[PDB]
Paper text:
Assessment of spent media from cells expressing each of the 16 full-length myocilin variants revealed WT-like secretion for T256M, R296H, L303I, S313F, V329M, S331L, T353I, A445V, V449I and K500R. Structural integrity was further confirmed by high-resolution crystal structures, which were solved for 11 OLF variants. No gross changes from WT OLF were detected for the structures of T293K, R296H, L303I, V329M, S331L, E352K, T353I, K398R, A445V, V449I or K500R, indicating that these mutations are accommodated within the native five-bladed β-propeller fold and do not perturb the dinuclear calcium-containing site. Thus, our data indicate these should also be considered benign.
Inherited missense mutations in the myocilin (MYOC) gene, within its olfactomedin (OLF) domain, constitute the strongest genetic link to primary open-angle glaucoma via a toxic gain of function, and thus MYOC is an attractive precision-medicine target. Myocilin has no known function, and there is no glaucoma phenotype in Myoc knockout mice or in individuals with a homozygous N-terminal truncation mutation or hemizygous deletion of MYOC, but rare non-synonymous coding mutations lead to toxic intracellular sequestration of misfolded myocilin. However, not all mutations in MYOC cause glaucoma, and common variants are expected to be neutral polymorphisms.
Author numbering: 244 to 502
Write the structure that this text describes.
């Protein structure tokens, strides 16, 4: 049931990192679980530092919330920032100190594709407002896989592109009028891009929207609470119909409502 975001719920804390290594990170479930994973399988990456390669994998939600991983993957090259996503059994992440997106098949621990995002800024050119090298932000919605970034030609404004999940080819790109470094993070619900206004305020908002299906740029004032005052990662999961976020060592989730 597609529609426009009209409400976000309170953040619920599901797991809390115990070390500075997890002050920021990314955690995710696959909207299209493929064998041997299911809808419960959760991945977790603590992303503080310059040699991030451990992907924590949990078979059951109970294990994500309590206990050790079922499995740890060692990525063949360090991962950059908090923007990665899992889709169709592959982890999609950005090579550190590069503009390359890498497709890592989880069940075989094999790199299946690599692709430079043409013209994309990286490593502090067009981060989100908190920095953290967040130049390139992958996304999964109801129609598939996207990447959110900017370029010199776009002059810091958010660009978004549909991505072929098999070979990482860019299927179509849109250009917004939202300065990327002026928002705390971004996500896509039903082909519409949403931005969050601040990463520190307990009274932030979802403040912009750009509908790729009609080209309309829009302004909103939907309350969004950063319960722990440092949201480093905010994504949308079209299967659970919920936002997944990482807020100052805390892995939280947000209920939503669409019109
Ligand atoms: Ca995001
Ligand atoms: Na992302």
């Amino acid at each position: 049931g597609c529609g426009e975001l009209v409400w976000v719920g309170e953040p619920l804390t599901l797991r809390t990192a115990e070390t500075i290594t997890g002050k920021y990170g990314v955690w995710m479930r696959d909207p299209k679980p493929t064998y041997p994973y299911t809808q419960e399988t959760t991945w977790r990456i603590d992303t503080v530092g310059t040699d991030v390669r451990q992907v924590f994998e949990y078979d059951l939600i109970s294990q994500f919330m309590q206990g050790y991983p079922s499995k740890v993957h060692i990525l063949p090259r360090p991962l950059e920032s908090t923007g990665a996503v899992v889709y169709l059994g592959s982890l999609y992440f950005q090579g550190a100190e590069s503009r390359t997106v890498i497709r890592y098949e989880l069940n075989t621990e094999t790199v299946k594709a690599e692709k430079e995002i043409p013209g994309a800024g990286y490593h502090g050119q067009f981060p989100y407002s908190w920095g953290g090298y967040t130049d390139i932000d992958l996304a999964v919605d109801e129609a598939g896989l996207w990447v959110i970034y900017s370029t010199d030609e776009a002059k810091g404004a958010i660009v978004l592109s549909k991505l072929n999940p098999e070979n990482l080819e860019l299927e179509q790109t849109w250009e917004t009028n939202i300065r990327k470094q002026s928002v705390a993070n971004a996500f896509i619900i039903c082909g519409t891009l949403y931005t969050v206004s601040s990463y520190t305020s307990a009274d932030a908002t979802v403040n912009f929207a750009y509908d790729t299906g009609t080209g309309i740029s829009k302004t909103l004032t939907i309350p969004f609470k950063n319960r722990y005052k440092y949201s480093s990662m905010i994504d949308y999961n079209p299967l659970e119909k919920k936002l997944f976020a990482w807020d100052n060592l805390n892995m939280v989730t947000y209920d939503i409502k669409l019109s």
